[PDB]
Symmetry: D2
Subunit: 320 residues, 4 copies
């Protein structure tokens, strides 16, 4: 197990954005903006800043042109400027490499610290961000498959029990998990905000990014995304779903972007804000734990996932 530091954990409010490296920016823009309908906060020749309909912070996604498709950062917003200091101190005590930039690492974000965490993932903690027009009631812009908010990340790592105790120490609570009779954790859903999760851990070769997920208001919005992809003849990019998750109870869809990064569209989970919210444990042999409808899980869903970068911009080696 990762040691529990003597300094307090930073107070994390929620997952906020992900910075992903793509190989052809124009091709990626077409998928994220023209197909999925995300809103462009701002952009230049090498970077695109996107946000969902109900977001007020500067962006939920940063697309950056690069030679190797990978995830550069999983960013979490902390409760106040002092928590950025707490985050840096906490990881330094763990012996992790850290880098602080008062001016931020991405446009629209202020003082931030990035770290190569104990599991090899590039994590960012920040508090300051530029506010932009919240498009919540801009129904003149509302598309039939509208993505309304960023919900969670999903990470692949070889040792799930080690990762779980580490995120618990950081203050995340386990709303649901999958265990065997021995009591060993195979996967866990973890949260700071009042939904089922901000991040999840899946067992496998890693560190790797399994997916980032956005929510819609209703189920028909998810169906429309599939319909539109069939009309555009890119239905081969629909990987799994739509279906109903056993774990989380969310109606879901997983699609692939042009570099193969996995995007989940999700809707309707439940409230986990209470202090003694009951953890739901599923047995590893329960056939409805993944797909409530018993649908077959595609093999690629367990084996393909995105590389993540270290703080110098190079891929972290995958432990097999």
């Amino acid at each position: 197990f990762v040691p529990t530091p003597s300094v307090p954990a930073p107070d994390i409010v929620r997952c906020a954005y992900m910075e992903i490296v793509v190989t052809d920016l124009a091709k990626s823009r077409e998928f994220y903006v023209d197909v999925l309908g995300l809103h462009v906060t701002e952009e230049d020749e090498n970077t695109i800043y996107l946000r969902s309909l109900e977001e007020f912070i500067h962006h939920n996604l940063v697309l950056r042109q690069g030679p190797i498709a990978a995830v550069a950062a999983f960013a979490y917003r902390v409760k106040s400027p002092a928590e950025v200091d707490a985050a840096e101190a906490y990881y330094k005590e763990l012996g992790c490499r850290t880098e602080r930039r008062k001016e931020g690492f991405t446009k629209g974000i202020g003082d931030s610290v990035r770290v190569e965490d104990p599991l090899g993932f590039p994590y960012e903690f920040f508090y300051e961000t530029e506010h932009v027009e919240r498009l919540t009631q801009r129904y003149d812009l509302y598309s039939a498959g509208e993505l309304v908010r960023l919900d969670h990340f999903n990470q692949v790592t070889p040792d799930v029990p080690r990762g779980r105790a580490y995120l618990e120490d950081l203050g995340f609570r386990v709303s649901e998990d999958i265990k065997d009779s021995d009591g060993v954790t195979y996967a866990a859903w973890m949260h700071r905000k009042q939904t089922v999760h901000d991040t999840a851990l899946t067992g496998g070769n890693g560190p790797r990014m399994h997916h980032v997920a956005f929510a819609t208001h209703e189920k028909h919005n998810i169906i429309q995304i599939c319909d539109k992809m069939g009309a555009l003849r890119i239905s081969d990019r629909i990987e799994r779903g739509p279906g109903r998750h056993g774990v989380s109870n969310a109606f879901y869809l997983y699609i692939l972007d042009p570099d193969g990064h996995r995007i989940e569209i999700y809707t309707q989970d439940y409230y986990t804000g209470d202090p003694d919210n009951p953890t739901i444990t599923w047995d590893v042999h329960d056939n409805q734990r993944r797909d409530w409808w018993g649908n077959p899980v595609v093999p690629s869903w367990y084996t393909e996932a995105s590389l993540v970068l270290d703080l110098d911009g190079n891929p972290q080696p995958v432990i097999v």
Copy 2:
């Protein structure tokens, strides 16, 4: 009563399109295309031809620039070219003014006959029409408030029993009506196709066009139209609804175009195709006959309606 001709009635398949005269074409285009999302089949400086998502005939609506906002024609498609002849013969026997144009009255329509019917309405019967791309599966074009097909017309006339017997002679059947204890008809819903109606008769000063109605696939599409109008700050053009009709059982919305013409958006009525489909009779005092939820009916809904034109292009005088 209007005499029953000795020649057979033309075989009418369904309501097909309406030609409306608007006072400012650019302002009307903005409402029908930019706000409601109808598809432009073709257009020129004085006329716009629009169609709904699942239509394959040339248009469901013709917008024509004119000095007086009014309805120029209610058009019905007949079963074969010979029914156009039958339509002309039938109205001639009734002594109505008729005009036949082998080349059609509107672009994309072939051989047609227009008549000033016994109630003063300009009716058109045609069979030939140019086919265009049916957009049924063009989900890349599907908007959140998509109108998928033209459903029916609604006409205001002073003597409903006279109008009902006249349309029955034409072969329309009454799926639902409103009567008093005396057995007198106050309103009637009439159809040729297998839905609740192609046209309806409402008692009042006329001849006048009460509304033309389009259908959506689901209820949330109707809600989105309201939401979008609120975002565009034109919610004062929402006249009545959304609500549930007692008569027809349809979920509905009535909005007003820039000249005040009333448009209904409707969804989910039931099948009436069987030969002995039961007529549903509602009593005039049943409070759920109009709005199933008991909502208040706006006074303007009973008093405002559009003028209709005679065959020379002049308004038919309204009998009060």
Copy 3:
């Protein structure tokens, strides 16, 4: 090809009901009434009469206890009493075995003729039926997965071109078909009523019943059926879907009853009522013709189908 008779074909209005033989009536009742929510018109120790929410004829399904699960009759309603005579005369001229019963074959149905048609299927034609309370507006009964009407049948037969030419002589029109470069029909969707089909032909070992289909009002009603089956732990009975069909454009779901008979839940196809409604032809190699989202079909969907009975109640041998 089946010869074309010299007498006119009976005027068929729509598919009306199917008589199914089940092996354990209590187990079947639980699935059709308690799980699917169909409404019991009446029942006895050996037979159950069910109807959908918006139906006014006596029943859409008849469940009958028997030794071998099979389909005893595909019933179509004809336009008037005289069409029952025309149906008998038409099949006698084709040399088919026919049996007429003035008092009907199932309760609530009057004068009917049943025939072993040229492809081996037991077809029934009737006009008279007892009317029952139409539950259209009984929202106090409306369930979250409500089936509102019977839509179509799907039949498996070894020679599709023969069956297609036969049904067209009967007056059915082809709304969509699947053909190869050579022009050979592999499958066809055929209709009398104004929807995509009343019956369809699938190539395979037959004669066999592939499925009977019911419609819901909206897409979320179909999703609820799946959710409820997962809660009841019978998700292993969901065979294919939910998905979007390329042919027909309908949102769909296929599930299996206790004896393995296949039921489709379907919603939202389009209007085919015009006399020149364009047939849509799909190529055999178009991967979006079955499932618009490119989902894998299930081998069982092409190989498993129900036996049908001859007029003496014995199963028709299946040609392989």
Copy 4:
């Protein structure tokens, strides 16, 4: 203004339940259970404990038989057992009457303190409660108009600025408010949990309970409630809506129980959890602040509200 205590405010997690006094328990049960579909946790001859689908604490509503219809308690769950002590200390310092019961005031709740707060409202704070089966995935129980969770309370008070400053000292944040050019608050929406509100203040004769609100998953669930009430002939109990709120952005419906207590059914507001979540201020003359579609409000909605009880069970006099 109410003085700000020197002891810290209790850490409040969310509104949790309301205790309502009804005049005929059988008539009320019929409305809450048979019509609305709430789930009975337990009941006796004089009291009914109800909860929503996704709730795990003992109840969200308590119905209690009594001589005068009124609200006996607005209950909030606090973060830990120690916060019950902090709540008692905070209100004692304000000079409010308080009553603590180690064994709870209603079944299933533990150590609780009730207070007659500065505005005259009976507030309860508790931590301990019995957990019951969370019905989240019991789709075999899911109704077409299912209420999934308790969302908020709305209170009527004569001095909104006083009440607002008081609740902010308690730690509630203002997600949206209505102000005039002068900066005076006419109404405010306040929250502890990550939705738009836990409670709201409406100006008027009070103290009175304006309404308690429950959420559904989707917009069609709210429409079904209306449809079912029309089928049961109790549409006269639908008071306002359905509509879209400007403030909060939620799709809504207000109905009346047998004693006239107002219930809101609500769905789809947005996330307010960030520490600098922007307050949205609406001007008093903006006609889309209440109903986004410009619908007329109902005078009864501003004038009628429920009496609330003091700690001895007698109604608090209403200041006019």
